[PDB]
Design a protein around this ligand. Structure first.
Ligand SMILES: CN1C[C@H](O)C[C@@H]1C(=O)O
Ligand SMILES: CN1C[C@H](O)C[C@@H]1C(=O)O
Lengths: 791, 791, 113
């Protein structure tokens, strides 16, 4: 395919890119804030982003058709000092070589940072506020590694699908015109509440001016570049870039080319406003079908040119990279800003939504073969064509690690459980890792922080004490030898959950506090229409739908197997005393290896074994029961099981477990089996995970599968992949994703990373370059069951 | 099974019962009201129900283990004079021989009614108020048959599942004790709002006293019968009957026997409170399982005895017969109190809820082969065992017409879309026909009236004028000869739908107003915990969850086929002019045999034909969108597709249709295809109906199939049944019902009613005795397609 | 002032915000001497009679104990709005410990004298 020549070139330029820390952005935000000292933080912040848009370096790389950036170079991490300024100050000298997700921070930019940025933001950024306010139960729980509570204080909101349909329908100018209209209607004489609205609308307008400017700056650049350009083919496409970028995102797109650039420019802009994951493109195959179909019908564009444009879009999307502090990076590894685009599902008539764009969204991932966007499919078994599920299976079989396949109706159920009516829930979008979003309409932190279900078992077993340090990290639910019955053990588990959940809810109040006060996102609020109606930022519940932020839960296999295996080994078989078990558990099984083999052999979640799976429904409905009792200004808290890479770091805090897990190793990824303990085929593993109440977890559920590639060869292999995927929908499993990789390729990538720079692996709801992950995360992935039987 | 000797006898007793009209209930209710002049309606109603409970004649039949009733004999319809007095007066001399559900009114009951009852209620009962008040837009649509509006003004709330768990765990004394305690904690010096609360708690207390009075009368009668009983076996049952009725529903049941009597006594008292369909027993299998299992452990009861009691219970429940006016009867034929009781589904942990009683639920129906209860299966494909599914299918194959199989997840989605949290929606119970409920927690009329989708299409084709009378009965949407394209045609269909829905919304305002003032249901409120916590009756928003009332929608295949066939004939194939078409429709195809053959041959809903099924999602999402724009004190209105038997009456107002349906015949039942048009097998039929957005209809959808018996022979035929039901779930289809009956039998049952008095047919969401249905409804059932191919 | 006070508060104090935020019609009328608008931005609330009866019946220790108790009943797991109350009560407690300290420094000074 001709356009693939260009795509290969763009890809090669993406691969050769070193990951660098951007500071110009942070520097311009600071100028903006200083330039507006004494104005409302929403004004300050909008002016800062206008300062960033008007002033940041911009570029148009060779062969680009779609253009833009969040930083001064592709793959560069940006610093939002209003949030995470102390991070760069604390790892100023280590970030370039830190274990997880290093960013090359030039000596130039260090000085810019230390001199022009860091001083202004001390005690002022969100992260510094949090460190100042953190209550002691949070700090105790966090320091003992039972919780991770810092992520969302470091990196903005993200975790939402902008109002792509509003931006396409109105353009940034139409939106700013509406804000201008609202603003003219308001009277500052009508009291402080109206002034607040005035401020927010003014802040919308500045943001809108900034964004249109950045788009005009690129047009100016392409203009100047084209004068300078000897090649008449490039010159032509450069002048086209000039005309496209002049029109959008200021105005509604005129064609598919422009609609793509509109989203891209806005995507970059909201990302620059707050570095964060999950600024979901969502259902591009629905948003852009009108322009694709018009052009094909008009002759102004061909299907292959549309694929070319989508492929460049993919590559531009991939040139962002989540920045974060070095701890959070082990929990969120591979620079996974994790921009989920999705394909398929149903339309507003509940009919099959699959169209040419749907297929080409998959085709953009196969072509470009990068870690982003996080390309997934809302798969409606009742409505979507086999051909569409098939193309997804071929994409998977190619080792693209995508798409992740969602049981559409599970996704709809989660949005209904979020309080969204069915008249709108058909239009849900998967978010970031596996969460649930709704274009321009739903507001939530989908993942404030992580509870370690493994920690929960360790606290029960060690009566609230860290096995690492010995300090009392949790509450004292008793000496486990005093448990007469399995019910008393279960009571202990439940009391600990109350404490872990209560502590996460404690953290959520500070997060909502600091967010509402210090994280206005006007550029994002531009595309949430309800924000325009009520005059309140996305941060202050302006969105149509607000739900409570999501509590994230890591260690399904570890909590489930420890409960099952303790019941089995201590309470039903009585194979060992509680005392002996505890000693085995204190020794990390050293000197008790017959006990360890007894633990390893006891029922294991992931096999359709009832002796293992009997407890899953109870624990996790109980867990979600606790989470939901907590109220916030945005609604009752939500729950998700999207461990990301956090199972690896969070396991370093958890000692040996009755399931056989040895101390400080990783907890289980996702909702699935512990590595090597599932040996009953894919289907049996799905049956086990179906015991989870997926619909209770409205922030989503994230399952991994690693398939032996020989199982996917031939049409027979493809059919079997589709059978399994249909099996997942039948079992009501929200989400699955597939690594399909010759396991020697992953081991060679450890020893000769240079020769596997584009090696993709599915981590946890998102894809990463394998050589770009910390070795422990690499090892976690390697040790995942290679599943040899479909079942 | 020995106990089948007692069930045979109980069943022969039931099958030989003449259906009579009770008046004593209305007489005593009139007394209670007279004895309470000057009191709030709620106190009156309550005192009138004490009087009914303490005075109505009671009986203990031979062989009965469970006792009670709602009238002077089994199967008698009762008159709540407060709701429908004037119907007995208008039909005083016709009701004993009216076409639909005759009720023999004894000359003596005629006299008591006319002298002591009718005078008091003129202009007083809700039916009288509605007729006084019925606005003229409702009248002229009702007139001309476009809507049916009169049901719920005649027949009290029903359509709900009472708080079975509250009754069972607290007993009526326990609840009365709470009402008394809330009463003592309120001070009537704190204003009109508290006095209202006080008034409500008193009404609960008075109700509660009467229900314990009624039970004790049964215990008394049993001990007196015991005195006169020679056989010690019977005498020992009568003594046991006495012991249990002294305890329940007053106190929590000490055993499974007592628990059954408890629900039944309570179920009869809330039916007496208001004649109404669908006081549903709900999930018996979950409410009673701990009684059954404790009793079996204690040797106090065997599974056989538990089965026998349940069979008794099934018959008892059958001994109610819904009452209504002569015209309502055509819409709801067969004395269809539709008391639904479902087994299966998932428990509070999301795990398989199937237990022994789940199987004994099906077993009872198979044993009793009566028209009620409406026994139905909540079937979770991911959790419920095949053994359960096969039992259901074995029961269907026997010709029991039950159970109806509900795709469990769809039931949950509808409760979620009613705003029930997934933390409680696992607990949904199908209601009356196919509506959704939540035990003791959800308030709404699930079916206030019927929109004729036929009528909608007739109103476009005839520009809002009746084909029967020529009157202008609907709005004007334009000569159909002026629709240049299908879009203007569809726009007119939308405009008609807007007006129909609008006029249904108008009638709902009256229904709520009358309901809230003149239809307190203190007995029912006893088992709604939240009415106790807020001190407002079920009728005044006391329940934990209120949704607006459900607009019923009839004529699915008719508007779909007419829409599809207009499009195919007039706009795509252009093989018939709109005028030619209208001239033929005005003629009822009289002399247009070629046009009628073309319409018959145009695509038909139900064959998985996109030429037909293309419009389904769009028209029916439009419709629910219209319904949902309307608010009430209880939430936005809701929608369901449960025509009952109203497709037969409502069809007598619809002329011929471009779908080829001749003038004034029945519309299509439920949501499936028109008889004789689905020629592609059951599975294609299910695929067509999957294009309906079942989710959006939170009051459910009702699908009929009729399967050639030969299709079900042997283990293979059961297998195909099960595959069909799994396909149902795969396709996200809420509900299916199965008639399985040799066609001759039906036709013999028309020639020889007396040879078939127990022949059961599945009508539309419920079962009737075929010989008790008006012939034209029998003919509709007969012309249903006998599916001869599973597909 | 200039070395330890002035730089911290530039753009921060209420009067700076007022000057930064002053709408222009307000500016015109103030520049024209038609309104005077600045003095409550300069100087705090005053213009109230505090709860003297409360001060006298309970003393600052009684009040601070009510705040310690309201604070102890509250749970910051219950959402941002509880958090805001917890912050307020904390601030009453802190400020009340300070008042008592100042009363005691005087007591200390009087005893030294
Ligand atoms: C990569 N992100 C996807 C989800 O939004 C959660 C995760 C994070 O915030 O760490
Ligand atoms: C048969 N009933 C079930 C529905 O809830 C209403 C219908 C009726 O009797 O009107």
């Amino acid at each position: 395919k001709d356009y693939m020549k260009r795509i290969q070139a763009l890809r090669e330029n993406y691969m050769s890119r070193r990951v660098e820390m951007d500071i110009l952005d942070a520097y311009y935000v600071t100028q903006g804030f200083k330039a507006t000292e004494g104005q409302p933080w929403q004004i300050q912040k909008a002016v800062a982003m206008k300062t960033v848009y008007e002033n940041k370096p911009i570029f148009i790389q060779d062969h680009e058709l779609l253009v833009g950036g969040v930083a001064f170079k592709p793959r560069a991490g940006i610093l939002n000092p209003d949030s995470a300024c102390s991070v760069i100050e604390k790892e100023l000298d280590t970030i370039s070589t830190r274990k997880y997700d290093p960013f090359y921070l030039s000596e130039e930019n260090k000085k810019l940072f230390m001199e022009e940025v860091a001083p202004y933001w001390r005690g002022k950024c969100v992260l510094d506020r949090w460190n100042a306010m953190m209550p002691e139960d949070v700090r105790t729980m966090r320091d003992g590694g039972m919780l991770y509570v810092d992520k969302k204080f470091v990196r903005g909101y993200g975790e939402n699908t902008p109002g792509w349909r509003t931006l396409l329908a109105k353009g940034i100018t139409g939106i700013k015109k509406e804000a201008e209209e609202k603003l003219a209607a308001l009277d500052d004489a009508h009291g402080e509440d109206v002034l607040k609205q005035i401020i927010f609308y003014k802040s919308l307008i500045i943001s809108a001016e900034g964004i249109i400017a950045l788009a005009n700056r690129h047009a100016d650049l392409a203009e100047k570049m084209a004068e300078k350009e000897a090649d008449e083919k490039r010159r032509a496409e450069l002048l086209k870039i000039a005309e496209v970028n002049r029109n959008v995102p200021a105005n509604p797109p005129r064609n598919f080319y422009e609609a793509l650039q509109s989203m891209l420019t806005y995507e970059f802009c909201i990302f620059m406003e707050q570095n964060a994951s999950s600024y979901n493109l969502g259902r591009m195959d629905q948003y852009l079908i009108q322009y694709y179909e018009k052009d094909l019908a008009d002759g102004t564009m061909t299907q292959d040119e549309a694929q070319e444009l989508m492929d460049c879009f993919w590559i531009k999307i991939s040139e962002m990279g989540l920045f974060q502090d070095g701890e959070s990076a082990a929990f969120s590894a591979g620079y996974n800003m994790t921009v989920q685009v999705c394909a398929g599902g149903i339309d507003q008539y509940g009919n099959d939504a699959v169209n040419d764009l749907s297929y080409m969204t998959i085709q953009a991932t196969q072509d470009t073969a990068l870690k982003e966007p996080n390309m997934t499919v809302r798969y409606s078994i009742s409505k979507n064509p086999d051909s569409f599920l098939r193309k997804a299976a071929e994409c998977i079989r190619m080792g693209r690690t995508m798409p992740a396949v969602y049981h559409d109706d599970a996704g709809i159920k989660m949005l209904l459980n979020k309080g969204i009516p069915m008249s709108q829930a058909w239009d849900w979008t998967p978010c970031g890792c596996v969460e649930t979003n709704l274009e321009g309409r739903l507001k939530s932190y989908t993942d404030i922080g992580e509870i370690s279900m493994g920690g929960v078992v360790d606290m029960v077993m060690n009566n609230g004490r860290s096995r690492k340090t010995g300090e009392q990290i949790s509450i004292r639910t008793g000496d486990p030898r005093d448990f007469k019955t399995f019910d008393d053990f279960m009571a202990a588990v439940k009391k600990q959950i109350d404490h872990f959940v209560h502590t996460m809810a404690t953290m959520n109040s500070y997060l909502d506090y600091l967010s509402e006060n210090y994280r206005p996102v006007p550029a994002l609020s531009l595309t949430y229409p309800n924000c325009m109606a009520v005059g309140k930022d996305y941060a202050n519940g302006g969105a149509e739908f607000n739900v409570g932020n999501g509590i994230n839960i890591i260690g399904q296999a570890d909590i489930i197997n420890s409960v099952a295996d303790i019941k089995y080994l201590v309470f039903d078989e009585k194979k060992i005393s509680m005392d002996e078990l505890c000693r085995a558990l204190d020794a990390d099984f050293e000197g008790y290896e017959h006990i360890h083999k007894m633990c390893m052999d006891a029922p294991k979640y992931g096999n359709d074994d009832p002796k293992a799976d009997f407890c899953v429904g109870e624990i996790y409905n109980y867990l979600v029961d606790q989470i939901e009792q907590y109220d916030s200004p945005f609604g009752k808290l939500t729950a998700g099981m999207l461990p990301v890479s956090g199972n690896v770091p969070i396991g370093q805090s958890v000692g040996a477990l009755p399931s056989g897990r040895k101390a400080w190793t990783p907890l289980a990824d996702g909702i699935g089996a512990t590595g090597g303990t599932d040996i009953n085929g894919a289907t049996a593993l799905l049956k086990s995970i179906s015991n989870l109440p997926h619909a209770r977890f409205t922030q989503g559920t994230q399952m991994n599968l690693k398939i032996d590639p020989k199982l996917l060869e031939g049409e027979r292999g493809l059919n079997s992949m589709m059978v399994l995927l249909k099996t997942q929908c039948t079992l009501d499993i929200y989400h699955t994703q597939y690594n399909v990789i010759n396991p020697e390729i992953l081991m060679d990538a450890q020893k000769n990373p240079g020769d596997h720079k584009d090696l993709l692996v599915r981590v946890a709801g998102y894809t990463a370059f394998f050589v770009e992950l910390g070795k422990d995360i690499q090892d976690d992935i390697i040790q995942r069951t290679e599943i040899e039987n479909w079942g």
